[PDB]
Amino acid sequence: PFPSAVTIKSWVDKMQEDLVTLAKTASGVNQLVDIYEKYQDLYTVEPNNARQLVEIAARDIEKLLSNRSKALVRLALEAEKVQAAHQWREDFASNEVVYYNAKDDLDPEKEPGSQRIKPVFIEDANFGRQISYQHAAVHIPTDIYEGSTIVLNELNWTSALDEVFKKNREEDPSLLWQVFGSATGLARYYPASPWVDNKIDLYDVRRRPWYIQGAASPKDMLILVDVSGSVSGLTLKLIRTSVSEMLETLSDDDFVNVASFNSNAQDVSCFQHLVQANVRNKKVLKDAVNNITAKGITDYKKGFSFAFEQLLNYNVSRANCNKIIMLFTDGGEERAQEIFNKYNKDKKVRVFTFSVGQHNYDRGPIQWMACENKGYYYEIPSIGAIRINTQEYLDVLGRPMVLAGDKAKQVQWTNVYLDALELGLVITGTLPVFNITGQFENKTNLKNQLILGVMGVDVSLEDIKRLTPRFTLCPNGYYFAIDPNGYVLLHPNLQPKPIGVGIPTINSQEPVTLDFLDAELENDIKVEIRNKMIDGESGEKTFRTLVKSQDERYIDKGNRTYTWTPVNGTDYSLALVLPTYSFYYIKAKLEETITQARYSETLKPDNFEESGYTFIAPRDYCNDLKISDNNTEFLLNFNEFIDRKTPNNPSCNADLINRVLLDAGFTNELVQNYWSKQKNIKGVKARFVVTDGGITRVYPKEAGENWQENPETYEDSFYKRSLDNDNYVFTAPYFNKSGPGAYESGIMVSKAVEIYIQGKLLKPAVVGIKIDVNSWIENFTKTSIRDPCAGPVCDCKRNSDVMDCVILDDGGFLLMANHDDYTNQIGRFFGEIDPSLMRHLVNISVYAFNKSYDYQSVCEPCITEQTQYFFDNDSKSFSGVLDCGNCSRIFHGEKLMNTNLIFIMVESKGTCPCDTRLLIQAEQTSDGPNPCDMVKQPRYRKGPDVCFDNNVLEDYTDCGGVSG
């Protein structure tokens, strides 16, 4: 039968009291608070003024980037002067240029004008590779011969850069890379290191995003593809490959749209006006281009009239400078002077014409189109010419900024991208290098309107993370930074993996561009905060948001405070997220050499038998102490270091060490004085304590092998979840995993320690226990069933045919049930067990869901869809009547007040058949949002305001037709 709602409410109270009392007593919660008050005077509570913290960090980042920019400035000055003083030799006799080619074998045991250097690489932990600080290394790509007269002159005159490289490194020993990408192809980076590692080097410095960023200004490109009949066959494949490679040379500040025309022009993809060259809009355009067919009769006057009209659309967001048309055709007879006289008569749009394929057609008109319209003419006769002939239009685009003089020389920082030499997430500052031969005397300006190359220095994101310390904050507080496009420069949720672009089709060069809204859970207030950060404003915003847990299975409803300020000097904006309870932190005292030894003798490796197996967080306390992935090794190193000399020494962090020692003392006093009195308890398997300082202790020595949590305290999902909840939190175990399930370790319940010192509020630690399944399953089958109620069971027996007692958590996962089959599936989502009660619970708003996208995820055969369920109405009694096909299941649900637990009682599963559409909470591979709809309603961005797109002094004589 189905007992009364009052009866279920009476049953749940006994189990709630049992669980709450057992978790309270077993893991000391009042004892730690009492310890924290009674050992006062050993620490002090200091404020976290968010306004000051964010400004200090912003000025630190500003100084770092200005240090980085000074090196670029002096490199550019020296390179310009040295090239200006160069004399063009044409013949080199035996050894005349001495350089280290970065792709040469280190032991050849064996050229036209070059003598190799045999360098000595020692090591450097700052880089990870083997480097030589003695000289610079040269990369010359595979196609370009290293004996050319234009390469040997570069290799000679650029040898003067090594002194400046050395001077920069000696003034700032933290410089990572100093590359000079040259317009001839070769690159010179100062710490001479072998080139990376089939295995065909396809690297070209003239296509890397930093070079393209520094070589021109943002563009409004419109590719016009000819798809008439005559381009059928090889020419079409060359055209598609060329268009894809051209699309690869586009940044997020650039806007592009691809059109095609046989006899009537049309858009190749769903986009209709112009889209910024994201990593995903570009994918859509590439996929659309790879599916075009050639049929018809060419009509230039209808394709150009289409391109010029899409370059006039101002309802949409665009770069608003450098308006260019790239015509991919083979050859024709029409030049269409009327169209150009009608649309482009003041010559505000450049036209670049490509004669793709191996054929024999008139090429005069398409050369004339480039010559008349301030453009250039290119020829792609095979696959090997695609790269070079698609990367060259930047030479044309850089003329107006070269003529701008010492006003186009501004340092610009790129998007976050993976370094070529396996260094991780880095950003690059760039500065163009101009040609100034014959400028001291008024001699030459015809060829001087071309950059020599681009300077570049790399700053790693680990540097920026070092400038923003995070250990005076709670685990829930963090920094993050936003550039004008909205992408994150800093975020806890940014991983060193390429951004997924779509579902991975069956059978490291792209930037890691992750938007702020894609790194967190989007919110109406967050869309406003992000716009204010982009605009370059500063303010505070305290509001109730929706935070997702570390393990990506739960959601908590936390109250956070966003404080942001612009990184004055650059275009970035820094923000600091802090919850309400994280406005104060514990600062340890100096104490005395007596107390240091007594606290540090507790975490001796032989000593965690009377004290409980101890973990230590791998945070850098001293320069000499080395971080290890095996916590035993790091704990031994930490112990021997503390034994050596004194706990307080130079080349260390006094605050970190003192905090760790204070936490060790508090934890040891707790574990001894309380847990040592009661060696074994009936319903617990292990008592643990995790504290902010870095220390994790599990009381049973044998239970330490089952502890699978991260030794870093600031990265434990249960700690972060428990901080946001003023009650007990049940963390469901993992289901179908190689580790020990909820039969040898137990089910974890955690409660956050809250201490009231002065009027301040602090949460410095979290304790908990792992409840054994057997004691609780034995306690579950007797505290809810009445014995003399009836012959047939009025509630669940050990294996009840009809009754289906089952208790869930705040995320819909299984924790315990009556049935043996159910109990065998502890830690599984209830949707995959009973896929009808689950969806009805969602529908009657027992639960709620909120779905997001993961872009940095890996798949087996990629963007991934994620789902998390959370309590919404937060009211107690949930009873109703679920309807199956031609049958009715009646259910009652009651929620424990002190824990995030729900007791759901359903009449019977077998009696009434419902359709079994499984509701899966696990992450599912999926395509991202439809790009068409997103580009119909784009996000807010503030593009660069400086652009050099026209100059009256520019010489258009180098059209490219008469030059070959």
Ligand X SMILES: *[C@@H]1O[C@H](CO)[C@@H](O[C@@H]2O[C@H](CO)[C@@H](O)[C@H](O)[C@H]2NC(C)=O)[C@H](O)[C@H]1NC(C)=O
Ligand Y SMILES: *[C@@H]1O[C@H](CO)[C@@H](O)[C@H](O)[C@H]1NC(C)=O
Ligand Z SMILES: *[C@@H]1O[C@H](CO)[C@@H](O[C@@H]2O[C@H](CO)[C@@H](O[C@@H]3O[C@H](CO)[C@@H](O[C@@H]4O[C@H](CO)[C@@H](O)[C@H](O)[C@H]4NC(C)=O)[C@H](O)[C@H]3NC(C)=O)[C@H](O)[C@H]2NC(C)=O)[C@H](O)[C@H]1NC(C)=O
Ligand U SMILES: *[C@@H]1O[C@H](CO)[C@@H](O[C@@H]2O[C@H](CO)[C@@H](O[C@@H]3O[C@H](CO)[C@@H](O)[C@H](O)[C@H]3NC(C)=O)[C@H](O)[C@H]2NC(C)=O)[C@H](O)[C@H]1NC(C)=O
Which residues participate in the annotated binding site for a divalent metal cation?
226, 228, 230
By CB under 6 A, is residue 444 in contact with ligand Z? yes
* DSSP line for 563-618: EEEE-TTSS-EEEEEEEGGGGEEEEE----HHHHHHHHTTT-GGGTTTS-EEE---
Shortest CB 60 distance to ligand Y, Å? 6
By CB under 6 A, is residue 439 in contact with ligand Z? no
Whole-angstrom distance, CA of residue 490 vs CA of residue 614: 32
Which residues neighbour 347 within 8 Å (Cβ) at sequence distance 6 or greater?
A: 373, 374
Query: Residue from 305, 317, 320, 568 that binds ligand X (CB under 6 A)?
Result: 568
Whole-angstrom distance, CA of residue 810 vs CA of residue 815: 11
Q: Which does 298 bind (CB under 5 to 8 A by kind): ligand X, ligand U, Ca ion, none?
A: Ca ion
Compose the 54-73 pattern: x for residues touching ligand Y by CB under 6 A, - for all others. Answer: ------x--xx--x------
Shortest CB 463 distance to ligand Y, Å? 8
3-state secondary structure of 481: strand
Which residues neighbour 225 within 8 Å (Cβ) at sequence distance 6 or greater?
A: 239, 243, 258, 259, 260, 261, 268, 289, 292, 328
In the bound state with Ca ion, the residue whose beta carbon lies nearer, of 294 and 841, is: 294
By CB under 6 A, is residue 546 in contact with ligand X? yes
Q: Which of residues 296-335 bind ligand X (CB under 6 A)?
A: 313, 315
Shortest CB 191 distance to ligand X, Å? 31
Joined tokens for residue 802:
């009809």
Q: Which does 228 bind (CB under 5 to 8 A by kind): ligand X, ligand U, Ca ion, none?
A: Ca ion
Query: Residue from 435, 565, 582, 856 that binds ligand Z (CB under 6 A)?
Result: 435
- At 242, give phi and psi (nearest 5°): -65, -45
Whole-angstrom distance, CA of residue 149 vs CA of residue 624: 50
Q: Which of residues 65-94 bind ligand Z (CB under 6 A)?
A: 88, 90
Q: Which does 230 bind (CB under 5 to 8 A by kind): Ca ion, ligand Z, ligand Y, none?
A: Ca ion
498, 418 in Cβ contact below 8 A? yes
By CB under 6 A, is residue 59 in contact with ligand X? yes
In the bound state with Ca ion, the residue whose beta carbon lies nearer, of 236 and 402, is: 236
Q: Which of residues 716-755 bind ligand Z (CB under 6 A)?
A: none
Which residue number has the CB closest to ligand Z? 435
b (16+ CB within 10 A) / e for 418-449: bbbbebebbbbbbbbbbbebeeeeeeeeeeeb
By CB under 6 A, is residue 144 in contact with ligand Z? no
By CB under 6 A, is residue 448 in contact with ligand Z? yes
How would you class 551 by CB atoms within 10 Å of its CB: exposed for 0-12, middle for 13-18, buried for 19 or more?
middle
The CA-based diameter of the chain, rounded to the nearest angstrom, is 112
Residue 729's beta-bridge partner residues?
A: 750
In the bound state with ligand X, the residue whose beta carbon lies nearer, of 206 and 526, is: 526
Query: Residue from 18, 34, 55, 958 that binds ligand X (CB under 6 A)?
Result: 55
In the bound state with Ca ion, the residue whose beta carbon lies nearer, of 166 and 237, is: 237
Query: Residue from 168, 184, 193, 228 that binds Ca ion (CB under 5 A)?
Result: 228
By CB under 6 A, is residue 854 in contact with ligand X? no
Whole-angstrom distance, CA of residue 263 vs CA of residue 303: 8
23, 749 in Cβ contact below 8 A? yes
Q: Which does 96 bind (CB under 5 to 8 A by kind): ligand Y, ligand X, ligand U, none?
A: ligand U
Q: Which does 159 bind (CB under 5 to 8 A by kind): Ca ion, ligand U, ligand Z, none?
A: ligand U
Whole-angstrom distance, CA of residue 89 vs CA of residue 150: 10
Please report, for residues 50, 516, 534, 541, 938, the alpha-carbon distance to residue 527 in angstroms, rounded to integers and kept in the order given: 21, 9, 11, 12, 12
Whole-angstrom distance, CA of residue 117 vs CA of residue 137: 10
3-state secondary structure of 726: coil
Alpha-carbon torsion, ordered 279, 280, 281, 286, to 10 deg: 90
| Enclosing H/E stretch for 528 | helix 524-535
How, if at all, do strands 848-854 and 814-817 pair? Answer: unpaired
Q: How many residues bind ligand X (CB under 6 A)?
A: 12
Which residue number has the CB closest to ligand U? 156
By CB under 6 A, is residue 171 in contact with ligand Y? yes
402, 448 in Cβ contact below 8 A? yes
Compose the 151-170 pattern: x for residues touching ligand U by CB under 6 A, - for all others. Answer: -----xx-xx----------
Q: How many residues bind ligand U (CB under 6 A)?
A: 6
Q: Which does 435 bind (CB under 5 to 8 A by kind): Ca ion, ligand X, ligand Z, none?
A: ligand Z
Of 1-9, 282-290, 434-442, 604-612, the segment contacting ligand Z by CB under 6 A is 434-442
Which residues neighbour 4 within 8 Å (Cβ) at sequence distance 6 or greater?
A: none
In the bound state with ligand Z, the residue whose beta carbon lies nearer, of 90 and 107, is: 90
Shortest CB 664 distance to ligand X, Å? 38
By CB under 5 A, is residue 298 in contact with Ca ion? yes
Of 139-147, 222-230, 437-445, 631-639, the segment contacting ligand Z by CB under 6 A is 437-445
Please give the residue ranges that form the binding site for ligand Y (CB under 6 A): 60, 63-64, 67, 171-172
Please give the residue ranges that form the binding site for Ca ion (CB under 5 A): 228, 230, 298
Please give the residue ranges that form the binding site for ligand X (CB under 6 A): 55, 58-59, 62, 313, 315, 546, 565, 568, 848, 850, 872
Please give the residue ranges that form the binding site for ligand Z (CB under 6 A): 88, 90, 435, 437-438, 444, 447-448, 452
Please give the residue ranges that form the binding site for ligand U (CB under 6 A): 82, 96, 156-157, 159-160
